[PDB]
């Protein structure tokens, strides 16, 4: 697909940041190496459900004033194409497949089959969690349902699973045409307190490490590489300075389009014609 690393990072960082900040022992583990007073002051101010201060995330160049006490500024950077395929063919498909998804589901009995229901039509099934079927189990997929023989499996009549699958758009042939790009985004934790900037740096590094395992950047946005700048005053001529430490996140990812092929051939036919010269 076409991709937007900045909007991915914003969407991914915001919930993760919230869920760490609402959970005191995570911060208590992340900041174990800092000075005791720095740790306790940060945990008192920003952390837990009762926290009176708050962190914020957003893109650069807003028209309004931000929470300069603690704010992650996201800042889309450079990139370049790095590797190309022969014919620019990144892949080919017989059935137009959408995004990868993971969904929780439960088995139910139906007509002496077990079935799992999924919210969308299954374009491909990658994994039913914790199950490997035998041929006897007569595994079949149909529409948005996975179906599974009941006879030997009655103990599992309400078994709970996670389905990893991917959507289908439509039944069509085509070529995925495109290339790989290596692209940079900068993130900086702004604070007018230097110890807050240093803690926001630690929290962001933890978040990015945790992010490396996510399906989003396992399937796309691969090879996350991190670089770190000096701590410096970002703005120097207010009533106080604003400090930050930049980090650069670099990703390798595919830019591509679905070139559908309308041509289809369903019968050869043969004829002999005679040359009398």
């Amino acid at each position: 697909a076409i991709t937007s690393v900045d909007s991915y990072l914003l969407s991914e960082i915001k919930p993760r940041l919230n869920t760490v900040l609402e959970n005191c022992y995570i911060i208590d583990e992340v900041l174990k190496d800092f000075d005791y007073q720095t740790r306790e002051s940060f945990k008192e101010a920003f952390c837990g459900k009762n926290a009176q201060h708050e962190v914020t995330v957003g893109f650069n160049f807003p028209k309004f004033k931000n929470n300069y006490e603690a704010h992650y500024l996201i800042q889309l950077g450079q990139g370049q194409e790095t590797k190309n395929s022969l014919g620019s063919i990144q892949s080919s498909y017989f059935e137009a497949t959408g995004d990868t998804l993971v969904e929780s589901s439960t088995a139910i009995r139906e007509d002496d089959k077990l079935v799992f229901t999924v919210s969308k039509p299954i374009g491909e099934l990658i994994k039913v969690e914790d199950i490997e079927f035998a041929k006897y189990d007569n595994l079949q997929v149909e529409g948005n349902k996975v179906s599974f023989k009941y006879q030997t499996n009655e103990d599992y009549e309400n078994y709970n699973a996670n389905i990893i699958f991917t959507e289908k758009k439509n039944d069509s042939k085509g070529l995925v045409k495109g290339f790989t790009v290596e692209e940079q985004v900068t993130v900086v934790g702004l604070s007018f307190n230097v110890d807050v900037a240093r803690c926001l740096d630690a929290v962001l590094k933890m978040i990015l490490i945790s992010m490396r395992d996510s399906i989003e950047e396992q399937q796309t946005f691969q090879l996350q590489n991190l670089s770190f700048g000096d701590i410096a005053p970002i703005i120097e001529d207010g009533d106080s300075m604003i400090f930050g430490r930049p980090t650069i996140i670099k990703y390798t990812s595919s830019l591509d389009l679905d070139y559908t092929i309308t041509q289809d051939i369903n019968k050869l036919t043969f004829k002999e014609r005679k040359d009398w010269k």
Partner: protein, 352 residues
């Protein structure tokens, strides 16, 4: 268990011998398929289950009655097979209280010597009550001296049960006294029960012969198919040869279902009633696992074992709640009911 010698413990200096006998124990094999009968007799003490081992003992205890003719047929239909034990009881109305007495007599097939449908329902209920317990059983029953196909269908539908079979035909047996004894169809059911008891575990009475002199009714192929499809056993008069004989068409059961052999066909039900069923490594040896690597591990193991001594398509793994169930498919021995021959006529160039 391991035996200590001496039995008494000792603490002063001594030797002691511990004996492992467990490498020699035996007799672990099956029961034989003892046959069971209930019906009218003279002489015997009513409602007492007698073991019988030969016809002389039968005529010594029982006399002058249809139970002794039944015991005769029960050993006369299978002369080329082992004449095994029979259990029999003179019954002097409810029959359950009597049938209870068989509950702990180790016999597998029973036949009531009665055509009354209440009796058959009682016997089916008894077979159910036993077989849902630890001691499986089956029953065979028959009609009167001549019943129509629609009567037989009505009876089978009323008595539709996966452990009861109905036999349609009735006929005449030559007894060892030379009497041409005309008998109702439930004595033919006794004869089939005797044969089925004589056959091996998971042999089948289909296409076995019946040593009967004549039949009251001869069914043509369409009627044999009708009765077979309805789960009713019928006897064919084989006419395609100068050596004519009577043949048991099939071992069908009054519960008929295409979706499960074990309830449709008596012999595979018996096999399931008598079949026998036959290593651990624990996750602390590894940091994390999944059903995929469990499957691949157990496939590598059984690949090594089968090389020293299984298809990846035929093992299923489920992991749930720190527990992994590994389920193999296995293939039991059935018996042929259909043979399909495709005959292709080619032609060939000879040359000389």
């Amino acid at each position: 268990a391991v035996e200590p010698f001496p039995r008494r413990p000792i603490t002063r200096p001594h030797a002691s011998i511990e004996v492992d006998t467990s490498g020699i124990g035996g007799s672990a094999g099956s029961s034989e398929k003892v046959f069971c009968l209930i019906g009218q007799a003279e002489g015997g003490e009513p409602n007492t289950v007698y073991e019988l081992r030969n016809y002389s003992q039968a005529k010594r205890l029982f006399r002058s009655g249809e139970l002794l003719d039944a015991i005769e047929l029960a050993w006369g239909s299978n002369p080329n097979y082992t004449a095994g034990r029979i259990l029999a009881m003179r019954i002097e109305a409810t029959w359950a209280d009597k049938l209870d007495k068989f509950a702990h007599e180790g016999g597998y097939y029973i036949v009531p010597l009665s055509s009354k449908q209440s009796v058959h329902a009682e016997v089916a209920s008894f077979v159910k009550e036993r077989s849902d317990a630890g001691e499986p059983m089956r029953a065979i029953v028959g009609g009167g001296f001549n019943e129509s196909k629609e009567q037989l269908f009505g009876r089978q539908a009323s008595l539709s049960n996966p452990r009861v079979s109905l036999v349609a035909n009735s006929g005449t047996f030559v007894m060892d006294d030379g009497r041409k004894n005309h008998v109702p169809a439930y004595m033919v059911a006794v004869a089939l029960g005797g044969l089925a008891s004589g056959l091996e575990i998971g042999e089948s009475i289909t296409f076995k012969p019946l040593r009967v002199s004549s039949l009251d009714q001869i069914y043509e192929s369409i009627d044999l198919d009708e009765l077979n499809e309805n789960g009713i056993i019928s006897i064919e008069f084989v006419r395609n040869r100068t050596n004519t004989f009577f043949r048991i068409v099939d071992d069908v059961t009054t519960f008929n279902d295409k979706s499960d052999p074990v309830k449709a066909e008596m012999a595979v039900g018996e096999a399931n009633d008598f079949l026998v069923s036959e290593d651990q490594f624990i996750g602390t040896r590894t940091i994390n696992t999944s059903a995929s690597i469990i499957k691949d591990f157990i496939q590598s193991y059984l690949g090594r074992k089968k090389r020293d001594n299984f298809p990846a398509e035929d093992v299923q793994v489920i992991v749930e709640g720190n527990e992994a169930r590994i389920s193999m498919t296995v293939y039991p021995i059935r018996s042929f009911k259909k043979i399909s021959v495709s005959l292709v006529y080619k032609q060939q160039t000879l040359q000389a």
